[PDB]
Design a protein around this motif. Structure first.
Motif, PDB file in Angstrom:
ATOM      1  N   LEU A  19       0.242  -1.125   0.233  1.00 34.64           N
ATOM      2  CA  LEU A  19      -0.286  -0.078  -0.051  1.00 34.64           C
ATOM      3  C   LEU A  19       0.920   1.188   0.084  1.00 34.64           C
ATOM      4  N   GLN A  20       1.230   1.587  -1.573  1.00 34.93           N
ATOM      5  CA  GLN A  20       1.630   3.221  -1.621  1.00 34.93           C
ATOM      6  C   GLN A  20       1.941   4.028  -0.385  1.00 34.93           C
ATOM      7  N   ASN A  21       0.709   4.110  -0.294  1.00 33.09           N
ATOM      8  CA  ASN A  21      -0.401   5.299   0.149  1.00 33.09           C
ATOM      9  C   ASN A  21       0.453   5.377   1.380  1.00 33.09           C
ATOM     10  N   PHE A  22       0.448   6.107   2.238  1.00 34.45           N
ATOM     11  CA  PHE A  22       0.903   6.952   3.744  1.00 34.45           C
ATOM     12  C   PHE A  22       0.052   5.938   4.619  1.00 34.45           C
ATOM     13  N   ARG A  23      -1.408   6.966   4.301  1.00 37.46           N
ATOM     14  CA  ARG A  23      -2.472   6.847   5.462  1.00 37.46           C
ATOM     15  C   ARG A  23      -2.776   5.259   4.622  1.00 37.46           C
ATOM     16  N   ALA A  24      -2.821   4.234   4.327  1.00 32.75           N
ATOM     17  CA  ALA A  24      -3.405   3.529   3.586  1.00 32.75           C
ATOM     18  C   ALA A  24      -2.482   3.022   4.341  1.00 32.75           C
ATOM     19  N   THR A  25      -0.869   2.868   4.718  1.00 31.05           N
ATOM     20  CA  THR A  25      -0.627   1.901   5.735  1.00 31.05           C
ATOM     21  C   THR A  25      -0.465   2.295   7.024  1.00 31.05           C
ATOM     22  N   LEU A  26      -0.896   3.551   7.869  1.00 31.26           N
ATOM     23  CA  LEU A  26      -1.326   4.329   8.822  1.00 31.26           C
ATOM     24  C   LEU A  26      -2.360   3.244   9.676  1.00 31.26           C
TER      25      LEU A  26
ATOM     26  N   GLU B 184     -10.817   0.072  -8.295  1.00 30.27           N
ATOM     27  CA  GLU B 184     -11.025  -0.007  -9.389  1.00 30.27           C
ATOM     28  C   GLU B 184     -12.402  -0.014 -10.404  1.00 30.27           C
ATOM     29  N   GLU B 185     -13.555   0.161  -9.113  1.00 37.92           N
ATOM     30  CA  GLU B 185     -15.123   1.137  -9.161  1.00 37.92           C
ATOM     31  C   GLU B 185     -14.688   2.240  -8.965  1.00 37.92           C
ATOM     32  N   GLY B 186     -13.807   2.340  -8.935  1.00 41.60           N
ATOM     33  CA  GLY B 186     -13.754   4.113  -8.784  1.00 41.60           C
ATOM     34  C   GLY B 186     -14.278   4.619  -7.964  1.00 41.60           C
ATOM     35  N   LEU B 187     -15.141   4.068  -6.525  1.00 43.39           N
ATOM     36  CA  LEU B 187     -15.938   4.247  -5.412  1.00 43.39           C
ATOM     37  C   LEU B 187     -15.205   6.006  -5.015  1.00 43.39           C
TER      38      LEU B 187
ATOM     39  N   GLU C 221     -18.063   5.242   0.022  1.00 49.16           N
ATOM     40  CA  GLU C 221     -18.883   3.965  -0.494  1.00 49.16           C
ATOM     41  C   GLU C 221     -17.896   2.782  -0.662  1.00 49.16           C
ATOM     42  N   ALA C 222     -17.117   3.447  -0.904  1.00 48.19           N
ATOM     43  CA  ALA C 222     -15.934   1.922  -0.722  1.00 48.19           C
ATOM     44  C   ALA C 222     -15.256   0.912   0.002  1.00 48.19           C
ATOM     45  N   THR C 223     -15.902   2.043   1.348  1.00 52.03           N
ATOM     46  CA  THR C 223     -15.150   1.096   2.441  1.00 52.03           C
ATOM     47  C   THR C 223     -16.979   0.297   2.969  1.00 52.03           C
ATOM     48  N   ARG C 224     -17.900   0.997   2.714  1.00 49.49           N
ATOM     49  CA  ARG C 224     -18.968  -0.022   3.040  1.00 49.49           C
ATOM     50  C   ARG C 224     -19.528  -1.055   1.937  1.00 49.49           C
TER      51      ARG C 224
ATOM     52  N   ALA D 178     -13.967   3.360  10.226  1.00 47.92           N
ATOM     53  CA  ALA D 178     -13.894   4.667   9.967  1.00 47.92           C
ATOM     54  C   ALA D 178     -12.856   4.686   9.565  1.00 47.92           C
ATOM     55  N   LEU D 179     -11.714   4.679  10.089  1.00 51.25           N
ATOM     56  CA  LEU D 179     -10.423   5.065   9.272  1.00 51.25           C
ATOM     57  C   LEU D 179     -10.241   5.051   8.335  1.00 51.25           C
ATOM     58  N   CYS D 180     -10.630   3.875   7.320  1.00 53.09           N
ATOM     59  CA  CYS D 180     -11.021   3.985   5.539  1.00 53.09           C
ATOM     60  C   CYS D 180     -11.929   4.607   5.323  1.00 53.09           C
ATOM     61  N   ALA D 181     -12.228   5.129   5.586  1.00 52.65           N
ATOM     62  CA  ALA D 181     -14.196   5.962   5.196  1.00 52.65           C
ATOM     63  C   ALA D 181     -13.660   7.481   5.394  1.00 52.65           C
ATOM     64  N   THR D 182     -12.361   8.146   6.408  1.00 54.04           N
ATOM     65  CA  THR D 182     -12.084   9.331   7.201  1.00 54.04           C
ATOM     66  C   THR D 182     -10.615   9.579   6.100  1.00 54.04           C
ATOM     67  N   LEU D 183      -9.699   8.602   7.041  1.00 49.72           N
ATOM     68  CA  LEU D 183      -8.347   8.933   7.146  1.00 49.72           C
ATOM     69  C   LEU D 183      -7.761   8.765   4.705  1.00 49.72           C
ATOM     70  N   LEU D 184      -8.207   7.603   4.663  1.00 45.63           N
ATOM     71  CA  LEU D 184      -7.861   7.273   2.719  1.00 45.63           C
ATOM     72  C   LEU D 184      -8.801   8.771   2.116  1.00 45.63           C
ATOM     73  N   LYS D 185      -7.767   9.404   1.522  1.00 46.99           N
ATOM     74  CA  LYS D 185      -7.796  10.414   0.581  1.00 46.99           C
ATOM     75  C   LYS D 185      -8.280   9.835  -0.595  1.00 46.99           C
ATOM     76  N   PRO D 186      -9.405  10.365  -1.655  1.00 49.31           N
ATOM     77  CA  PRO D 186      -9.785   9.842  -2.810  1.00 49.31           C
ATOM     78  C   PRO D 186      -8.799   8.849  -3.636  1.00 49.31           C
ATOM     79  N   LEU D 187      -7.349   9.368  -4.110  1.00 50.97           N
ATOM     80  CA  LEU D 187      -6.231   9.119  -4.418  1.00 50.97           C
ATOM     81  C   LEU D 187      -6.331   8.732  -5.710  1.00 50.97           C
ATOM     82  N   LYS D 188      -7.396   8.885  -6.674  1.00 45.58           N
ATOM     83  CA  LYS D 188      -7.605   9.090  -7.728  1.00 45.58           C
ATOM     84  C   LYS D 188      -7.337  10.572  -8.626  1.00 45.58           C
ATOM     85  N   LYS D 189      -7.556  11.140  -7.635  1.00 45.44           N
ATOM     86  CA  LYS D 189      -6.726  12.767  -7.553  1.00 45.44           C
ATOM     87  C   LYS D 189      -5.279  13.026  -7.788  1.00 45.44           C
ATOM     88  N   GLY D 190      -4.654  11.576  -7.026  1.00 51.93           N
ATOM     89  CA  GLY D 190      -3.065  12.486  -6.683  1.00 51.93           C
ATOM     90  C   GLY D 190      -2.884  11.342  -8.273  1.00 51.93           C
ATOM     91  N   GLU D 191      -3.670  10.570  -8.970  1.00 51.74           N
ATOM     92  CA  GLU D 191      -2.874   9.844  -9.494  1.00 51.74           C
ATOM     93  C   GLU D 191      -1.275   8.890  -9.779  1.00 51.74           C
TER      94      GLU D 191
END
Lengths: 1032, 1007
Positions: free
Chosen positions: A359-366, A422-425, A429-432, A491-504
């Motif tokens: 998980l290259q994302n730092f928040r996703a690692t946290l 994949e789905e781009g949610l 919604e992705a966490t749900r 909750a952390l996935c729904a809040t800490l995770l940025k959409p991460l698709k903007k960052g490309e």
């Protein structure tokens, strides 16, 4: 539940903070130990039969006591000893987990039953029942720096000013003294006693009457006269102080006026015991204190208090006196605990790094990393609630837990990441959707990782205790992880995770780009290979059968043990000269050994403390113990500075020594279990043959053990036969002469041994007054006629008239095990040989012995045999529990059957890792094997649950299993790598208790490697085959 | 939930009546105590070594028991006393909450091993393990009004007919007797003994040989034949000695109101209720009184139940007055009578539910729980008041019918009702987990206050909605409208002040920086006040009793002690007469130890109503006595009030143990003790400083030349026996009097055992049968020894007790004492024991509770309102109330004790309540989209009335506590003052600062 906390992140944060705070409070309030109790409680029954031979004492008392004692509640085994000094001690070890108080009560009741059957002399002397805690927490040496204070002066000062306050420290059960304080010892000469027609009883009575302090009332008592002025207490007389006053005791006044003074009939001295411990420290005269830890007390706290008090007392020592810590246990405990803490922190760091890799994302690692402190502190809270402590076992369980507890968090985070990519949610919604998809998988993983450790808790003995320590911690960690995975992580996935698709993140070159390319290519190749092996079933079925055969082969090949030995920085060398040797010869041998240690192991030895002689309480001066303390682990080398290397090098030279039997042995793994490391065997004489036959069998066994290179440092934990006095007093002859039994018994005690009378005040301190025979007279078969005891009429009946004394050659100390004359034989396996192999070799040797001489393992050997015998049951029960739980979860039998087929794929890897490393099948391996079973079930679940869901929805089995493997490859890989790199610091730990860490880590790491690289291919095969056999 | 009971009022009424009935049943079955089991459990091991000196007893018996007992579970500390009479008592005190029976069992198990090591004589005597009661429930005195019955006759009658029946009364652990039964005293005369050439041993052996037929009258003893001459004449016992029927023990000489008397010290059995046991004892005594000889009458010299009953009655009175004042203030804000009644009805329901909870949990009706109830009265009505106020506002503005108005109000404020209860209950949760005496006190309040809060939420969402939907009338626009009298003026003033308040709030919102600086200054002042405020454990109470202790110099006879006692009794009878009911004195008994030079005197004051409130308080008269007593130089006389908690310590003030942390020397310890006493006497901050022990006493050691003794053919046993019979006493045999077996003692007559040279008047029988004078082989010599030796935690120690000077807290006094110890020679250190130890523990662990309580409240608020901003805004107003609590406590002269701590917790809760009442509505408005300024201003305008009325209800509920004048006035003042000041500051500052905090936080963290 999951959806509830997704929309209320602050609630999840509050719950996590509550867990963290409770855990911090628990950590600050949790006791620190090396090990839990882990020791069968022991209760010792002590009896004394003055002036009785060892055989007579054993027959009249020991056996009787044993008979009544047999049949207790949890009596594991009875061990008894009968000493020539007249003391009989029968030890009763109860099954682990038995409350000591109840055992003591039962022993006391049966002692009440048996007391009447005992000889009346022993009953008058008294029989004591107590729980024996013999753990020597620390040994202190007091040495005079200036040399102005003599060894006897040091011993007197210690026993007067230091021993008493130290005994009052909390948790100090008994503080042994390796030096005796001064006492007003009065040496009677029977020649003078017969010259003046005075018996020893007359001297004792005169000392009692003249040296006394009695209050006789008050000057000015309450019904006083009208106008008295003073009200004072009145004392009859005073306690004698100087030796000269004792010489002036009257004992008689003749009609002519002459008085038979005490100095005229005896010699009084303010000396010390006849045979005091000739303790030495680094080649200098010194005294010692042996502090023993009271039952049910914390070793570290007690040692700190004692050291603390001693420090205080030190501030008030006479000039030139200082104390040295010859033997210390808490140093190793602190070092080991700190090392395990460092290992845990390094494990957290490596888990973070391996998660960051996938998980290259730092928040996703946290997000999974935050679960580690929360679950860890919740586990500490659970430990505090159940009364457990911070010990090596619990800390090892925590380090093992880390990789397991991060599993559910990792699964949730990466499923959210996959849905986002994949789905781009959106993250919410992705966490749900992720929770809706993998809610079942998390529960299954927690079930498989927690059900394995449940049955372990229901076992008994030291083994069961060890298992329970791991169970509780790991079960609590898994429960919290499945709770955290459904509360905090969503909750952390729904809040800490940025959409991460903007960052490309796609298109960002670097090391991660190459890693992603390699991972994608390998995943495609993996799916192709899974399809191929699905088509080619028979070949891989054959390979699986071959793996099963190899697993069985390695199971049979692997040597067994109980607990790895550790470099505690200490070891003890015992010196035993041939029987009858004087204290000076033992001192010479001790000096030779000290010279060897100073001139050969000069870079590793910190201090050597020798204790020559059995001391005032004992029989032979041909015994010496040498407490050896090594330097810090950092200062000593990691290859030649280890305790084991030093012990082997010393053992070679000491086996070269032919003057006396000298053995250097490391301290035992568990303090209360055994006296020293290695196997512990009792050579029972089942045939009931003679004692000399048992001694000959012992000699044969020792010779054979010396022959075998697999065995080293094999010795007899006992004493050799020596000539011994046997004062035989005929009660009927004495009563015919009219001489009282009490009078003759007291005279015998005074002559043959020593008799305490009363106390005298020395420098404001009361000290004992002993009446003893003169130096040449020790109630020998020759001088017994010189002693006279007056009868009722007063006529001095000679002692020889009613008593017979004769020299006799026999064992000074007679031992029995479980109703059989036995000699305890202890030893250690040679380097590269496990304890189990050594026990097998000893059994072969005892088979080689003549008939009627069986063997019975005791202490750590007994419990190692118990664990080895009970190991297959646990495995079977744990596998059954996992199977039943999986069947309950999926409401099917095909899925759990498919999962359980992956268990051999991890066991083979664990066996390979331990076999290659050189470790052995100990308790740790067992718990490890259990961890490997759990993790193999984890990977199997991660695949089969999704495959089964796809099949139930209606997808083709081949397509369903291929899709399941393709999707769940990354979760399995990253969870397994997280665990592998979590346990990697354990397998590569250096210093402190590195042996235990290696033993725990190696097997589980190998099991994980095998479990991944085999399961990711075989689990599809198992699921497809089972579904084809049993369709829907 | 709320809507359910709106349409079904009968269900809510049934629930309320059920709760009330359960509470009423609980009240009449709930035990009444002054304090719950706050004292740590003590286990005492007593060993008797006859004819053993104090040093020998300590060396052989006390040290062995101390060494063995080390290692017990939850052993707080050990204290031991080795008395010269041969009795050694090792007192072990365990942590509060430890099961006494388990402690006793552990002590017995440890003692069983130690039994063997003890000397054989001690084992024969028998070591006993007993739960330590040591709590005199009542000291009764028996005085003969006529004077026909002599003091010894009184004591004998008491021992024969009263001590036995009372000891069998349930709950009476022990009954100490300050008298002695009759005994046939046979006073020997050495002159007559020499006349007939008979030794004391001859008389002793003859009387032993004489004795189920036992001599009864003294004349029969005087007819005992000691020797028959060859002439036929026989020497009678009366011919050589004087036979009298005296006491078997002459230790105690008790005196009641200047008249001879005997007393009984009744001690409470462990765990028994004090009031019930005292009532039973007194009842039984009355039955016995029905048969007392003419003139004899019992009088209670010490009684505890009087103060307990008076204090409980006073607290019930202040509780009822609090309810009345809450009703009055609610009627002031809610002019409608029914609108006032609706929150009032919640009070009985919540109170009786709390009583039921206490009964279920096993708690009792003590001072702590009653104080908690008084606090909850102001606390509990908060939710009901808010509901009723919102309903009234909706009816006034919207004009809706009561049912729909109540529905809308419940919908609007359901959140605030939960939040207020959460903050008011979360503060008292962590307090329950603390330990020691302090934790127990906290729990009494926590259980009570938390139960009251939970029942308050339950009533607010069940009973009050139904009452509002039914009891309320739409007559707000009718009967209520058109007010013209006082209420019209009040409403006009309130409206104008509310407009001014809103305008000022807007202005302060514009001028942020100035008020931020003001808030920082308030923080600094709060810290300064908290540091400056002195500390204590519990306030001393005027219990109507106190004790004076007399300690003449060592070696002083009983008569001199009686003379000093007479002087003190005359002082009490003359100088302090309008305040003293009776004085009961006992020569020979003392707190430190028993001896002829020590006397303890019980003083019982008149009722609180009779005594003056200013100069008749126990403290004032005790200070005047100490001024007068300090002038007495014949002896050391100290007047001390009873301890705050019965089992904690012997007397009020601090209690320390000066001990030799290293080194040795009993003489060095005594010199250090003398230095410490001198330094304490120098200090003006310390008063009544003394050591609870006995100074070294002269001892007459006799030296015997064994060479001469054997030269004359005299056995040592005979010369010891003669000495014991003459100087000491000899229990020769028994005799039966009035159907009771009583002892017979042989001892030298007084004139012949009164000087050291009296040893020469005695003779011994040698082997040949001749009379050898004692002068041949005896030499008297004077020395010095300690009658009573003490050890605390192993070290030799002296127990030094004392009290702080008026105006000085106990904590300051303890700090002063610690300063004085540093001036002693190196090697001597102190340890605090008894209540003083608990005070140090509470002070040490105080900051944690606050931190933990604040954190828990913050986290609960964050969880409830799903925002970090809301609790951050709320928690900032806690200092605004803490400053007021500190200021009020400092101004009134009170200190930082346990009650203040629970108060500070209450003030935290109240500040959180007001902050919630504002920010909840403000945050809701802001989330709906309204402008932050408009939202906060509207929230203040709407919630000003509920905040003010709830706060006024609480402050006037606690007002009677802060102004109480009853028995337990000190504790009520300590509890009420801080909370009232904190609430006042909380309102008058929060109603302005809370908008600032919320606005600033939201601007820094926009939604």
């Amino acid at each position: 539940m999951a959806n509830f906390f997704i929309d209320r992140p602050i609630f999840a944060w509050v719950l996590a903070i509550l867990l963290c705070l409770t855990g911090t409070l628990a950590i600050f309030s949790l006791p620190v130990e090396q090990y839990p109790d882990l020791a069968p409680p022991n209760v010792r029954v002590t009896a004394n039969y003055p002036g009785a031979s060892a055989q007579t004492l054993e027959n009249t008392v020991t056996q009787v006591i044993e008979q009544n004692m047999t049949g207790l509640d949890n009596l594991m085994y009875m061990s008894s000893q009968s000493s020539g000094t007249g003391q009989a001690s029968v030890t009763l070890s109860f099954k682990a987990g038995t409350d000591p108080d109840e055992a003591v009560q039962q022993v006391q009741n049966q002692l009440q039953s048996a007391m009447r059957k005992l000889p009346q002399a022993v009953q008058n002397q008294g029989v004591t029942v107590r729980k024996t805690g013999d753990t020597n927490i620390l040994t202190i040496a007091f040495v005079s720096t200036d040399g102005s204070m003599d060894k006897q002066d040091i011993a007197d000062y210690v026993a007067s000013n230091i021993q008493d306050p130290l005994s009052r420290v909390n948790g100090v059960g008994d503080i042994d003294a390796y030096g005796s304080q001064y006492s007003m010892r009065i040496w009677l000469d029977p020649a003078k006693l017969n010259s003046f027609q005075m018996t020893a009883k007359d001297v004792t009575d005169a000392i009692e009457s003249q040296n006394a302090q009695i209050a006789v009332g008050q000057l000015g008592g309450t019904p006083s006269v009208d106008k008295q002025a003073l009200n004072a207490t009145i004392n009859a007389q005073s306690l004698l102080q100087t030796p000269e006053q004792f010489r002036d005791i009257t004992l008689r006044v003749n009609q002519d006026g002459s008085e038979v003074r005490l100095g005229d009939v005896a010699t009084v001295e303010m000396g010390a015991e006849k045979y005091d411990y000739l303790s030495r420290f680094n080649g200098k005269p010194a005294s010692g204190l042996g502090v023993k830890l009271a039952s049910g007390a914390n070793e570290m706290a007690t040692a700190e208090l004692v050291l603390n008090r001693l420090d205080e007392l030190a501030q008030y020592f006479p000039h030139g006196l200082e104390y040295k810590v010859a033997y210390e246990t808490t140093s190793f405990v602190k070092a080991s605990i700190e090392d395990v803490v460092k290992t845990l922190l390094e494990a957290i760091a490596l888990v973070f790094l391996v998660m960051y890799l996938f998980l290259q994302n730092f928040r996703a690692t946290l997000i999974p990393t935050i679960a580690v402190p929360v679950v860890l502190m919740g586990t500490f809270s659970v430990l505090y609630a159940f009364g457990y402590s911070v010990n090596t076992l619990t800390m090892f369980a925590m380090v093992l837990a880390i990789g397991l507890l991060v599993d559910d968090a990792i699964v949730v985070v990466e499923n959210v990441e996959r849905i986002m990519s994949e789905e781009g949610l959106t993250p919410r919604e992705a966490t749900r959707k992720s929770m809706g998809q993998i809610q079942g998988a998390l529960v299954g993983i927690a079930m498989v990782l927690s059900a394995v450790f449940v049955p372990m808790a229901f076992f008994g003995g030291t083994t069961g205790a060890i298992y329970r320590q791991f169970s509780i911690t790991i079960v609590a960690a898994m429960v919290l992880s499945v709770l955290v995975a459904m509360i905090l992580t969503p909750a952390l996935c729904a809040t800490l995770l940025k959409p991460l698709k903007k960052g490309e993140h796609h298109g960002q070159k670097g090391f991660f780009a190459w890693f992603n390319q390699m991972f994608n290519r390998n995943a495609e190749r993996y799916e192709k290979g899974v399809a191929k092996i699905l088509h080619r079933s028979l070949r891989w079925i054959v390979i699986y059968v071959l793996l099963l055969g190899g697993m069985v082969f390695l199971f049979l090949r692997l040597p067994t043990s109980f607990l790895p030995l550790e470099d505690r920085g200490m070891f003890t060398t015992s010196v035993q000269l041939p029987s009858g040797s004087t204290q000076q010869q033992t001192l010479k041998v001790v000096e030779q050994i000290e010279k060897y240690y100073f001139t050969h192991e000069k870079d590793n030895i910190m201090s050597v403390f020798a204790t020559v002689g059995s001391g005032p309480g004992g029989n032979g001066q041909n015994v010496a113990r040498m407490f050896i303390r090594l330097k810090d682990w950092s200062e000593r080398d990691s290859k030649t500075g280890t305790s084991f290397a030093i012990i082997e090098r010393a053992t070679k030279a000491f086996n070269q020594i032919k003057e006396a039997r000298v053995i250097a042995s490391s301290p035992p793994a568990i303090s209360g279990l055994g006296s020293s490391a290695g196997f512990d065997m009792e050579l029972q004489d089942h045939a009931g043959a003679g004692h000399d036959a048992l001694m000959a069998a012992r000699n044969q066994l020792l010779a054979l053990a010396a022959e075998n290179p697999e065995l080293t440092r094999v010795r007899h934990n006992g004493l050799d036969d020596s000539p011994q006095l046997q004062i035989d007093i005929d009660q009927r002859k004495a009563q015919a002469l009219g001489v009282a039994i009490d009078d003759i018994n007291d005279t015998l005690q005074t002559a043959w041994g020593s008799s305490y009378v009363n106390d005298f005040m020395d420098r404001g301190r009361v000290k004992k007054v002993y009446v003893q025979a003169a130096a040449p007279y020790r109630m020998l078969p020759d001088d017994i006629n010189l002693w006279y005891v007056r009868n009722k009429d007063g006529g001095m009946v000679p002692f020889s008239a009613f008593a017979t004394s004769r020299w006799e050659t026999g064992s000074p100390r007679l031992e029995r095990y479980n109703g059989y004359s036995a000699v305890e034989i202890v030893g250690e396996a040679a380097p590269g040989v496990s304890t189990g192999t050594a026990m097998d070799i000893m059994e072969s040797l005892v088979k080689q012995l003549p008939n009627g001489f069986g063997l019975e393992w005791t202490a750590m050997s007994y419990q190692e045999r118990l664990s080895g015998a009970q190991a297959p049951a646990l495995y079977a029960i744990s596998l059954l529990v996992v199977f039943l739980c999986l069947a309950a979860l999926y409401e099917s039998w095909s899925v759990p059957f498919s999962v359980m087929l992956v268990v051999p794929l991890g066991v083979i890897g664990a066996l390979l890792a331990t076999w290659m490393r050189g470790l052995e099948n100990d308790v740790y391996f067992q718990v490890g094997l259990l961890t490997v079973i759990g993790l193999s079930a984890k990977n199997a679940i991660l695949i089969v649950e999704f495959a089964n869901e796809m099949n139930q929805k209606g997808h083709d089995l081949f397509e369903a299993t291929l899709h399941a493997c393709r999707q769940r490859l990354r979760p399995i890989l990253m969870t397994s790598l997280a665990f592998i790199f979590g346990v990697l610091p354990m397998a590569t730990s250096t210093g402190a208790g590195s042996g235990g860490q290696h033993a725990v880590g190696t097997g589980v790491m190998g099991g994980m490697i095998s479990a991944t690289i085999l399961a990711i291919y075989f689990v599809p095969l198992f699921f497809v085959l089972v579904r084809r056999r049993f369709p829907l």
